[PDB]
Amino acid sequence: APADYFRVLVQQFEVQLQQYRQQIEELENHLATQANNSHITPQDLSMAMQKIYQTFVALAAQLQSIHENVKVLKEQYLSYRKMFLG
Amino acid sequence: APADYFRVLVQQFEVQLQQYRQQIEELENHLATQANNSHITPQDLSMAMQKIYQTFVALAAQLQSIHENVKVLKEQYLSYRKMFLG
Amino acid sequence: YIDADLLREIKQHLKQQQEGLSHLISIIKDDLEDIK
Amino acid sequence: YYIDADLLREIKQHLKQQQEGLSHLISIIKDDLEDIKLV
Amino acid sequence: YYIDADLLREIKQHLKQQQEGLSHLISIIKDDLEDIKLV
Amino acid sequence: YIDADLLREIKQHLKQQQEGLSHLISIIKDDLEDIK
Amino acid sequence: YIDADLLREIKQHLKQQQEGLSHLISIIKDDLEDIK
């Protein structure tokens, strides 16, 4: 059923959202002050900047395919309308 | 210079330490209560459990090679002692 | 050292846990809001 | 201790672009949903 | 909502093993350093 | 969209930033303590 | 006159011969002692 497929794309999207969210908040705090910045190294930030950019890329992909999916809902909804309502 | 090599192994170790540390604290909070657990999904924890186990594996590797490195300090320190102090 | 069967079990268990679309959506909505 | 006051600025800029990136995609998606209600 | 009260226990157990794992390695390393001072 | 030159620059900059072994060690010591 | 292949062979052979650290050290210790 499409409800099993939908739930999946939705679920993956929600994980990259949570993923990115945590990371960003994490990195915000580390750069919030020099006091908190001293408990980290310039090689940790370098690590985080990667982890974060990787999520961004995956998240941006999920938003993109969500866009394509909505494009498909419209096309098919439009087609049905021409068949049954015109 | 060995001070450039040392600083590196030490630095990587410090990153996996910080990495693991953040993740664990992160996961602790999510499972701290059902109130906080409701803002996450069973597919997020599944994600984190992986991220965490991956760090653990890399951290465990770094601790292992640190052990081998200390084994080498001892062997060479012991050798020098036999050459110069016996 | 590390029990393989357990991590496996933990995996299986979470996968079998199910998503309440209503709930899912609400999390996403708050996630998007908390950022953009 | 810490990092350059401008290295901070660079990262903050990078993160902002990432944000603008994701928001643009969300924007587009919203136009799609809104246009559905209009068609 | 949340997860099983025992699924929680399973994860908590897994994390503990990971901890015991790392601590064992630290232990060994400490014995090495201590034995260096003794030899 | 995303400026490649900048992320690169940010990489280069952090790599060139240097480690104070003394500081490094103190972080590790507190990290190990905060866990084991 | 002089066989190149042989000296080469003699070189190769001695290089492939191996050092018993234990033995090495004992020689050094007696060398240092026999002098300083």
Please write down the HEC assignment for all residues of G1-36: CCCHHHHHHHHHHHHHCCCCHHHHHHHHHHHHHCCC
Q: What is the resolution of this structure in A?
A: 2.5
Helix (H) or strand (E) holding E6: helix E5-38
Question: Dihedrals φ, ψ of F34, to 5°?
Answer: -65, 0
Residue of B nearest to A27 (CA): B22
Q: How was this structure determined?
A: X-ray
Among the listed residues D14, E12, G1, the one whose alpha carbon sits nearest the alpha carbon of residue B52: E12
Cα torsion through B6, A23, B43, E17, rounded to 10: 30
Give me the DSSP letters along B32-67. Answer: H-HHHHTTS-HHHHHHHHHHHHHHHHHHHHHHHHHH
Among the listed residues G10, E29, F8, A13, the one whose alpha carbon sits nearest the alpha carbon of residue B66: E29
Task: Answer for the pair F31, B14: CB distance below 8 angstroms, yes or no.
Answer: yes
Chains that touch B (3 or more CB pairs under 8 A): A, C, E, F, G
Chains D and A touch (3+ CB pairs under 8 A): yes
Minimum distance, in Å, between the CA of residue E22 and any CA atom of chain B: 6
Single-letter amino acid, residue G2: I
Structure tokens at F36: 């084991």
Cα A22 from Cα A27, distance rounded (Å): 9
B77: left (phi over 0), alpha (psi -120 to 50) or beta: alpha
Minimum distance, in Å, between the CA of residue E33 and any CA atom of chain C: 23
Three-state DSSP string of A11-32: HHHHHHHHHHHHHHHHHHHHHH
Cα B37 from Cα B40, distance rounded (Å): 5
- Cβ distance of C32 and A17 shorter than 8 Å: yes
Domain ranges of chain A: 1-86
Give whole-number Cα distances, C17 to A1, A18, F23, in Å: 18, 18, 44
Q: Which fold has domain A1-86?
A: Helix Hairpins (6.10.140)
Handedness of CA C15, B58, B18, A58 (dihedral sign): negative
- Cβ distance of D26 and C35 shorter than 8 Å: no
- Cβ distance of G32 and B83 shorter than 8 Å: yes
Cβ of residue C29 closer than 8 Å to a chain A Cβ: no
Among the listed residues B59, A41, B27, F27, the one whose alpha carbon sits nearest the alpha carbon of residue E8: B27
Task: Answer for the pair A19, A55: CB distance below 8 angstroms, yes or no.
Answer: yes
Single-letter amino acid, residue D2: Y
Minimum distance, in Å, between the CA of residue C36 and any CA atom of chain B: 18
Task: Answer for the pair B30, B40: CB distance below 8 angstroms, yes or no.
Answer: yes
The DSSP output letter for F1 is: -
Among the listed residues B83, E35, E38, E36, the one whose alpha carbon sits nearest the alpha carbon of residue G22: B83
Chains that touch D (3 or more CB pairs under 8 A): A, C, F
- Cβ distance of F3 and D14 shorter than 8 Å: yes
Chains D and B touch (3+ CB pairs under 8 A): no
